[PDB]
Design a protein around this nucleic acid. Structure first.
Lengths: 8, 8, 8, 8, 8, 8, 8, 8, 8, 8
RNA sequence: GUCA
Protein backbone atom coordinates (compact mmCIF):
# COMPACT_ATOMS: atom_id res chain seq x y z
CA UNK A 1 0.00 0.00 0.00
CA UNK A 2 1.41 3.35 -1.11
CA UNK A 3 -0.18 6.69 -0.20
CA UNK A 4 0.96 10.16 -1.25
CA UNK A 5 -0.28 13.43 0.27
CA UNK A 6 0.76 16.83 -1.08
CA UNK A 7 -0.34 20.07 0.59
CA UNK A 8 0.25 23.24 -1.42
CA UNK B 1 -3.42 -0.30 -3.46
CA UNK B 2 -2.00 3.11 -4.37
CA UNK B 3 -3.64 6.44 -3.57
CA UNK B 4 -2.52 9.90 -4.69
CA UNK B 5 -3.74 13.17 -3.19
CA UNK B 6 -2.73 16.56 -4.58
CA UNK B 7 -3.84 19.84 -3.01
CA UNK B 8 -3.22 22.98 -5.06
CA UNK C 1 -6.98 -0.50 -6.41
CA UNK C 2 -5.56 2.78 -7.72
CA UNK C 3 -7.12 6.15 -6.90
CA UNK C 4 -6.01 9.59 -8.06
CA UNK C 5 -7.21 12.90 -6.61
CA UNK C 6 -6.20 16.27 -8.05
CA UNK C 7 -7.31 19.59 -6.57
CA UNK C 8 -6.71 22.69 -8.69
CA UNK D 1 -3.53 28.38 -15.68
CA UNK D 2 -4.38 25.07 -14.02
CA UNK D 3 -3.33 21.67 -15.35
CA UNK D 4 -4.29 18.25 -13.99
CA UNK D 5 -2.50 14.99 -14.82
CA UNK D 6 -3.64 11.61 -13.52
CA UNK D 7 -1.76 8.38 -14.25
CA UNK D 8 -3.50 5.14 -13.32
CA UNK E 1 -0.31 28.73 -12.11
CA UNK E 2 -1.12 25.39 -10.47
CA UNK E 3 -0.02 22.02 -11.84
CA UNK E 4 -0.88 18.58 -10.46
CA UNK E 5 0.92 15.35 -11.37
CA UNK E 6 -0.16 11.94 -10.07
CA UNK E 7 1.80 8.78 -10.85
CA UNK E 8 0.13 5.49 -9.92
CA UNK F 1 2.90 29.09 -8.62
CA UNK F 2 2.19 25.75 -6.95
CA UNK F 3 3.31 22.40 -8.34
CA UNK F 4 2.54 18.94 -6.95
CA UNK F 5 4.37 15.75 -7.90
CA UNK F 6 3.34 12.32 -6.62
CA UNK F 7 5.40 9.22 -7.41
CA UNK F 8 3.85 5.89 -6.43
CA UNK G 1 3.49 0.20 3.25
CA UNK G 2 4.89 3.57 2.18
CA UNK G 3 3.32 6.90 3.16
CA UNK G 4 4.46 10.38 2.15
CA UNK G 5 3.25 13.63 3.70
CA UNK G 6 4.26 17.03 2.33
CA UNK G 7 3.36 20.33 3.99
CA UNK G 8 4.09 23.54 2.10
CA UNK H 1 6.07 29.55 -5.02
CA UNK H 2 5.44 26.14 -3.45
CA UNK H 3 6.74 22.86 -4.87
CA UNK H 4 5.97 19.39 -3.51
CA UNK H 5 7.81 16.20 -4.47
CA UNK H 6 6.84 12.77 -3.15
CA UNK H 7 9.01 9.74 -3.89
CA UNK H 8 7.51 6.38 -2.92
CA UNK I 1 7.17 0.40 6.38
CA UNK I 2 8.46 3.82 5.33
CA UNK I 3 6.84 7.11 6.35
CA UNK I 4 7.93 10.67 5.55
CA UNK I 5 6.61 13.87 7.12
CA UNK I 6 7.58 17.34 5.93
CA UNK I 7 6.39 20.50 7.68
CA UNK I 8 7.09 23.82 5.96
CA UNK J 1 9.02 29.86 -1.32
CA UNK J 2 8.37 26.49 0.32
CA UNK J 3 9.56 23.18 -1.14
CA UNK J 4 9.11 19.65 0.21
CA UNK J 5 11.14 16.63 -0.88
CA UNK J 6 10.28 13.09 0.23
CA UNK J 7 12.59 10.16 -0.49
CA UNK J 8 11.24 6.70 0.32
C1' G K 1 6.11 0.64 -3.68
C1' U K 2 3.94 -4.50 -1.85
C1' C K 3 -2.96 -1.57 -7.01
C1' A K 4 -8.16 -5.05 -10.11
Amino acid sequence: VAQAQINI
